[PDB]
UniProtKB/Swiss-Prot annotation, chains A, B:
Homodimer. GO terms for molecular function: adenosylhomocysteine nucleosidase activity; methylthioadenosine nucleosidase activity. Pfam families: PNP_UDP_1. The active site is at 12 (proton acceptor), 197 (proton donor). Catalyzes the irreversible cleavage of the glycosidic bond in both 5'-methylthioadenosine (MTA) and S-adenosylhomocysteine (SAH/AdoHcy) to adenine and the corresponding thioribose, 5'-methylthioribose and S-ribosylhomocysteine, respectively. Also cleaves 5'-deoxyadenosine, a toxic by-product of radical S-adenosylmethionine (SAM) enzymes, into 5-deoxyribose and adenine. Thus, is required for in vivo function of the radical SAM enzymes biotin synthase and lipoic acid synthase, that are inhibited by 5'-deoxyadenosine accumulation. It comes from the Bacteria. Substrate binds at residues 78, 152, 173-174. One of its GO terms (biological process) is L-methionine salvage from S-adenosylmethionine. InterPro entries: MTA_SAH_Nsdase, Nucleoside_phosphorylase_d, Nucleoside_phosphorylase_sf. GO terms for cellular component: cytosol. Pathway: Amino-acid biosynthesis; L-methionine biosynthesis via salvage pathway; S-methyl-5-thio-alpha-D-ribose 1-phosphate from S-methyl-5'-thioadenosine (hydrolase route): step 1/2. It comes from Escherichia coli O6:H1 (strain CFT073 / ATCC 700928 / UPEC). This is 5'-methylthioadenosine/S-adenosylhomocysteine nucleosidase.
Length: 226, 226
């Protein structure tokens, strides 16, 4: 089993990279992929690009060149569900584009031609991730994650998202693009995001902590799936 | 020299695929790439998917696997300029995302982190495409093309694009994603789009005519470049 890891938190990627044994660095399309073993398990690690296309570019290179069995995609996200708190860890049951609209042709909002309305995370990965999170004494919340090429900052942006996806619990900029590429490559995936802020509610205190714990979560999830 | 060709119109890809000599077909990540020689010139042909991520996925595979020296990206788009008419052929001098927004952090509208505000098509490739179109007795219009994961059918969506991009003359769904991937791979490209309809003014009927013209244009450009 080979596990692909795509992380958006630089510190998490560094922490994991430094732990890889027999580390090899592959440079393609302006991306760097680290391969080797993490506690005996073969892995392929990549720092996530920003936005749908850059994230898709890196994921495509990794999936094609390393051909992993599964993808674990980590990062941070803004919370949409009111019951969330900074530090919570959301686990995707599915991912949708909040900025895709071809409804004029009968497609469901957010759905793109040739794709399902939402991209489903693998049941086994979801369960394993949720178990690894609880073991670290952290709080995991399962649900719909939406993404788009926009940094949601104001009320209007949030309103549109909550209106189109009242069930969405988190939002960011790369999750659905990675799920989409994984879907097209028929590779199981799970998206996990530490909640950095909540829509209607310290930097280091969050990022320093989230990145470290996410890396431990990944290490634990890799061994579990192994 | 090796020329990469990515076209949106199914019929154009078929016409060009049928002309490739010593044709080989490569199946990667759900995509099909045809390689061989077009009138003696090494080419790599691929039909673009729908949307930024699908388009980026295919482009990434072609650029990495085939290492083309240049990219010719064809298709169709909706006209934004009032002087444009169905049938005109827009040649991009630049490509921008009309649905990317990180202005909260000083980015120009449509610009994403890690990228320039817009992606510039190659000066030499632009001029060459313009010459080929003129030689075919067709009308080429040079300008900004914007892309996003949505079909624009007038209304508020159209007004928003005209407001944010006064200079944009055409709009579709893949151009900028492909330009973006080429940019990251540092490969010269040129975007060309036949105008299928104009804002405020049959798709298949248009396609039956434009797809054929576009294929001849591509063939001519390949030779002109070789
Ligand atoms: N509020 C937000 N909108 C988009 N991407 C984000 N990434 C983290 N927070 C985000
Ligand atoms: N008006 C339009 N908006 C988005 N994609 C298009 N593709 C062709 N015409 C289009």
């Amino acid at each position: 089993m080979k596990i692909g890891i795509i992380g958006a938190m630089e510190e998490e990627v560094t922490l994991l990279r430094d732990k890889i044994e027999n580390r090899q660095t592959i440079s393609l399309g302006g991306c760097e992929i680290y391969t080797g073993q993490l506690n005996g398990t073969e892995v392929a690690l990549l720092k996530s690009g920003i936005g749908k296309v850059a994230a898709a570019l890196g994921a495509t290179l990794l999936l094609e060149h390393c051909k992993p069995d599964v993808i674990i995609n980590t990062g941070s996200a803004g919370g949409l569900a009111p019951t969330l708190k900074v530090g919570d860890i959301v686990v995707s049951d599915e991912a949708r584009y909040h900025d895709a609209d071809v409804t004029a042709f009968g497609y469901e909002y957010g759905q793109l031609p040739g794709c399902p309305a939402g991209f489903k995370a693998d049941d086994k990965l979801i369960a394993a991730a949720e178990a690894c999170i609880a073991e670290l004494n952290l709080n995991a919340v399962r649900g719909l994650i939406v993404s788009g090429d926009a940094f949601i900052n104001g009320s209007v942006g949030l309103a549109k998202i909550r209106h189109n996806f009242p069930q969405a619990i988190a939002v960011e900029m790369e999750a659905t693009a990675i799920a989409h590429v994984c879907h097209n490559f028929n590779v199981p995936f799970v998206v996990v995001r530490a909640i950095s802020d909540v829509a209607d509610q310290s930097f280091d205190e969050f990022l320093a902590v989230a990145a470290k714990q996410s890396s431990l979560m990944v290490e634990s999830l890799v061994q579990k799936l192994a």
